Amino acid sequence: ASVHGTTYELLRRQGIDTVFGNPGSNELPFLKDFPEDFRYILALQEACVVGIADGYAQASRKPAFINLHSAAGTGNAMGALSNAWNSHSPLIVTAGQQTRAMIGVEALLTNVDAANLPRPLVKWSYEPASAAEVPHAMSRAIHMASMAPQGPVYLSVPYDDWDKDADPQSHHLFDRHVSSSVRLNDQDLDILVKALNSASNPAIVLGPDVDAANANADCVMLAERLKAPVWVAPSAPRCPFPTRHPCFRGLMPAGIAAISQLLEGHDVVLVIGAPVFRYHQYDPGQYLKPGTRLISVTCDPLEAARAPMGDAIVADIGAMASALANLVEESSRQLPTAAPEPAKVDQDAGRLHPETVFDTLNDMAPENAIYLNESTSTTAQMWQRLNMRNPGSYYFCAAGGFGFALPAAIGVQLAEPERQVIAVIGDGSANYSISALWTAAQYNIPTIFVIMNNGTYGALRWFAGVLEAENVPGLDVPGIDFRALAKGYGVQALKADNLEQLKGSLQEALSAKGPVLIEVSTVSP
Amino acid sequence: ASVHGTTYELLRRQGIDTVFGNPGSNELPFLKDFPEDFRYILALQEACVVGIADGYAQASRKPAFINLHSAAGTGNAMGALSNAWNSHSPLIVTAGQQTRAMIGVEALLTNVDAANLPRPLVKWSYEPASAAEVPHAMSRAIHMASMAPQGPVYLSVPYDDWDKDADPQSHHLFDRHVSSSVRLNDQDLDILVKALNSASNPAIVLGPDVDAANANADCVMLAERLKAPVWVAPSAPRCPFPTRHPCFRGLMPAGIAAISQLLEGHDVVLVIGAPVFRYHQYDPGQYLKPGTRLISVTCDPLEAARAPMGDAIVADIGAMASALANLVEESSRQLPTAAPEPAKVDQDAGRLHPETVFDTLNDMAPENAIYLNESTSTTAQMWQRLNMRNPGSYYFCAAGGFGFALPAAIGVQLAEPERQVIAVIGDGSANYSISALWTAAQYNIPTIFVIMNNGTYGALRWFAGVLEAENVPGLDVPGIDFRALAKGYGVQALKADNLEQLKGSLQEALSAKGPVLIEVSTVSP
Amino acid sequence: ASVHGTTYELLRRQGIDTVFGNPGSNELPFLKDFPEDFRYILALQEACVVGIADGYAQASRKPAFINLHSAAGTGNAMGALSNAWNSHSPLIVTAGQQTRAMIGVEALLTNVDAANLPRPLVKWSYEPASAAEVPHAMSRAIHMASMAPQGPVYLSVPYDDWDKDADPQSHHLFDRHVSSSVRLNDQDLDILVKALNSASNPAIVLGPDVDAANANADCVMLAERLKAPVWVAPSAPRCPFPTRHPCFRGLMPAGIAAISQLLEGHDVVLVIGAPVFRYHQYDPGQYLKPGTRLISVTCDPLEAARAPMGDAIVADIGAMASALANLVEESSRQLPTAAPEPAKVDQDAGRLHPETVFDTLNDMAPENAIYLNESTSTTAQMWQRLNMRNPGSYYFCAAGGFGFALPAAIGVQLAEPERQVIAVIGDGSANYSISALWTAAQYNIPTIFVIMNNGTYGALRWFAGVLEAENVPGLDVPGIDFRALAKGYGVQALKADNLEQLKGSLQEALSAKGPVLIEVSTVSP
């Protein structure tokens, strides 16, 4: 067998059947004779390729396979990899290298010192020392991406390797099973359970690795047993809990003092599947108030090490959530009361308040919709106003890097063809990965894109207000016609300048048979 | 003084007056109180920011200053940095970091292990250990970018540093002059000169560092004195010689065997300002044929080290070209004869041959036009058909990474407001950095963008033919309306489906007062 | 030809004829069939291997070739590489890697991520992608080490590569000449010369790259023409000037304020071949006083970039010193007066003051002796008391890393067989690389080792005094019998407990036919 044939066999035997890519010449020897049972999903720029693959991996809860062109293609994807690192996304990033015979001279398209390029944003990065090593290196990539804590990995392959003879002993790679589905030992788990059972006023905080593990339902049972309020850890990349369940208390503010004040009076705070904590703003004060202790369950040693407070347990989130939910006592405390409905904000016949937009989306979207957020000045309102009952219903760029939601929404929609995906993206954010729209058109992936257009980088104008910072340049983005951009890439486009038009546009979009972009005129901050 | 005030003083004292950026919160403390004497040029995605700055630096022959947002913003620019590395572009890339007090916890927007992120594509990469060090670190960045061999550098700055007190001793940084304008010692230079004077059939090969040094005219005098043919080194990022001068012989093929065959019978080949050589295709054979020896003058130790043949001298290209041109004897050999005019290719009233496009551009454009190339299936024809008399008239992505020409053409046009810039970009390539169009519209930078639209990644379809590679996915890019994309970003748009329409569109574009995009329907390969 | 044969041919054609090594199994395929015209110099630990090679390279002014065993052997040498980086030592460090077929599985002795191991202490670090690339990679290593600024480089070679067929085109590597012997262009050089000619009270500061370039005599002529005092830049790794010449003013103190005070009243300070400056102690104040400006000539862009003050010129030190010395006017100012003789310190019949030791060495050693210093509490006295008339007469660990002088003194003695080498090493320092003594014995390299034994880490006890730091552990090193260690490794050993015994021991040592160690009982601080 060739390296080519052996590698595609390994991929299929490990469950991979789709290549997300933007091709180049170093990749043609890999892509030729592309197997009939594989899909190729083309995107026009590599941030888009990786964002699509990332949404696909996160929603499918399985690794996604990417093929990029040498250093420049890898480099174009490096912002996308920063988000994938923070979301623990299992991405296998392959890039084509020059033929081994011209690497030395640094021919055009040589990826110099290739493994260092995507560092520090990958779990593992490698270029094999010979063609026959390529299948083994691919095996390592697959498992490194897939083992907890999941994350992106990088493999560079000289283009001449694919046609070489494979090692016959590579067949031992095909069916390897590797598990990190582990939980705390019985003795220590019993100690934890008894601490939870004994708490007088426990609280639970959940992060994105709960949703990645599909541990959401177990966390609902855990919260119901403990009679405990549930918050989402700050800067949330995913939604780990039904947002209308009576225990739900919303998104935590991303500040040190704000969080300790919120947790005051809770004697034990159990954090599951989150860093402790992904703060953002400067908000100095106590990490925890006297009387509160914290216990973190994380899949990631790096999270456990850097927490400034609390105990930690490094284990699989699915296995730990299941065990805890089934072992704790049913507390005789009263179940927490559901949060009240959000108020309706006054809305005239002009530009839309974001609150109006989210209320209308919640009114009209299916109960199994999936939302993406890249409209950060409106995040709080979004979290208050969308009833997200099911797992896998929310994605936000985990490293704060824009250009995620537009392509990721296409990958999520590909992963979940029966769940309507609705990406809510600011006018500023929409530009970073605008060319991803073309992939939705070409493959008829029916994502809905809602562009919140207020002409400015509103979150930055707001932060400049906070700093009392005058004379900051570069905060306004006038003069973008998003309907024309959508037309450019073959996506049906609608505009909503008022509420009547928003309702009508959403009705059409929800009925449409392909992707749709709606440009919404929103109020300026 | 504050670190902020001291740093802007250093920048202005070192000749920097423009910031190319896409802002974020870690950057607001740097950007506030933005000085009245500085410009800020906003672009909507960081590959665009860096491409604009790169074109500006290359055309201006001076460093350009960039400000990006943390890891994700840096990462989005990493493909652009791969080109900047290969073109020796003097780019000072700054990125904002989290406040020092939350770096440890890895708050959102912390750039983890920041200096390793842009490696291996930068000459120097650093994060200072204290606020008061920032001006000194900035000084190091400026000089590292600017010293030969020029190249991109990276500086990460925690946002809390800017308001801190500066060291009063930082004033010694402001007026430092650093020179690398050096040439070979007299004794060895005399040996070189006598070898050139004694050659029976010398040839000259020029690379991009000639154009960067504005050594073009000196190289013309050198070639005239030696009576020597002049070629451009392969994979050319710049044009180092007048393309209708009698000594000019064109772009070298990017192959080992092809180059040695071309140089056969030349006893001494003098290469100036190029790697030896930036080959591309696989074309094995002799590096040089018997009877040819090679001497390379390069500004870059890395180029001198990796050449597989020849002697080398590591020195400034401007200083060496001037010295050689003024020291060599006037040979009594006959001056080389100019290459013949290109033939006119037959053209019907339908889709345009690329040869027709280039001939029409050459017929209509001003003699001081500046061209950019990101239409690689047509590169040979472009080099044959455009008379480029002046320095700074041609740019092509130096690492082969697409997404360069569209933004770079805007930066070049900003650098050279009296020279009409015309970017010739394939339909595939146009997408990578499409959002850069917005910057041309907003600042009214009157670049002309000629989109060569044949619906496919033509160079890859061609290479797949060469490999006899069947069943390669992802090679076609149908369904993009470039006029609508231009309208999306506020740029006047025209279409040319035939020659009559091409002439009319170019006439309008050349008369226009702002940027113009022309979508040309070109023949499919 | 094989890769083995081609590589040894390249080495010999490039002037390399000696391998400094400590062997292992990954190296046996390289070392077998060792060529008859090469020497192998064995040392027992890799810090010793590299230190010997470093002294050899520095004294010979040419690259030295090293062969180490995989990661552990490389790692053992990493402190030695820190000194080599700071001294600009041209060292070609090769390390054997596992066979390509087991690199993937990470067999024992695989050097994982090999090129990153010696970073950041090497100029270039690489592992080739195929066996046939090895000669080209070796060529790159040779030139990268040898081009200005010189420094250590690293090449990892899988052991199976050596027996493979070489590329016949590798012959073009054998005779490549690469020059960085460059100086400032005429116009700017004339500006510099006129600034020196116009100075009212110039000063000159010289660093180690002067001695590396053998620019010492040119700097003497320059100083005589300018009538200028000459100092050695702080933390000096080499001696760049005759220490009894009338212009000589000694070693600068390694402090910011101390240096600006020393330079006060000098209008132009010309620094040649040094960083600006290798300060050490904390001594805050002005970098320069009003009225002093600084001009630096350096071979190293990194030095030019980081200087906190002054102009800089990046060029070859040999070429620049020669040009300046021959172009400046003869000033009509009076030549500086020689420094006075050092005083004799009172010495009783007991333990030796260091001043007594240095005076006795100066009284007894040949005029062409070469000294090494790893007795840092006595550095000032050493520099005052040894008349060093000739180039190449002094070495001190350039990064402050102990374990340099003992092995380096053996390499220097190998490089300079007719110049008696005398290493003056503290009792603490002597231990770091003690096993290097064996190489002197085995190869009968007749270095003299003078161990200054006061039982303590005296410089640290002193610095703890400065900090008023109480209760510092680990500062005393009692209970070492250096005569027994010398006997252990086959080196003749003598003891000197008083001056009579010091004179007698030096008389014997200077007459001896092999290496000699003298343990001197020195006064405790």
Ligand SMILES: Cc1ncc(Cn2c(C)c(CCOP(=O)(O)OP(=O)(O)O)sc2=O)c(N)n1
């Ligand atoms: C890749 C990238 N570049 C820049 C930013 C910085 N950034 C930017 C540019 C913001 C403004 C986004 O504007 P928008 O129109 O998308 O949304 P709002 O108006 O709701 O802020 S908020 C913020 O952090 C970023 N997060 N990611």
Ligand SMILES: Cc1ncc(Cn2c(C)c(CCOP(=O)(O)OP(=O)(O)O)sc2=O)c(N)n1
């Ligand atoms: C960033 C990036 N990604 C992918 C490629 C690979 N690439 C691609 C995608 C080519 C096709 C370009 O198509 P085009 O329409 O711009 O021009 P042609 O039709 O003339 O080939 S040629 C080539 O090397 C690249 N060079 N740079």
Ligand SMILES: Cc1ncc(Cn2c(C)c(CCOP(=O)(O)OP(=O)(O)O)sc2=O)c(N)n1
């Ligand atoms: C490799 C290494 N480790 C530790 C040190 C630290 N060090 C040490 C250990 C000193 C004491 C040296 O003692 P000595 O006996 O050699 O000389 P003195 O008594 O003259 O200080 S001074 C100093 O910087 C060092 N420079 N290099």
Ligand SMILES: [Ca+2]
């Ligand atoms: Ca409602």
Ligand SMILES: [Ca+2]
């Ligand atoms: Ca906005």
Ligand SMILES: [Ca+2]
């Ligand atoms: Ca014509």
Ligand SMILES: [Ca+2]
């Ligand atoms: Ca095309």
Ligand SMILES: [Ca+2]
């Ligand atoms: Ca004396």
Ligand SMILES: [Ca+2]
């Ligand atoms: Ca001591």
Ligand code: NA
């Ligand atoms: Na990197």
Ligand code: NA
């Ligand atoms: Na290292």
